[PDB]
Structure 1
Amino acid sequence: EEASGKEVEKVATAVLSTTARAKARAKKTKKEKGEFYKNKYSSKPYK
Structure 2
Amino acid sequence: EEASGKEVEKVATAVLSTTARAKARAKKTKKEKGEFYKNKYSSKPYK
| Runs ≥4 residues deviating over 6 A | 29-35, 40-47
Structure number with larger C-alpha Rg:
2
CA RMSD of aligned residues (A): 3.5
Q: Which runs of 5+ in 2 are unaligned?
A: none
Aligned-residue sequence identity (percent) comes to 100
Output the TM-score relative to the length of structure 1.
0.49
Instruction: Please list every run of 5 or more consecutive structure 1 residues that lacks an aligned counterpart in the other structure.
Output: none
Provide the residue aligned with 2:15 in structure 1.
Answer: 15
When the two structures are superposed, what TM-score results if normalisation uses the length of structure 2?
Answer: 0.49
SS of 1:22's partner is helix
CA distance in 1, matches of 2:4, 2:34: 46
User: How many angstroms apart in 2 are the aligned matches of 1:4 and 1:19?
Assistant: 23
Tell me: CA distance 1:40–1:27, structure 2 relative to 1, closer, same or farther (3 Å): farther
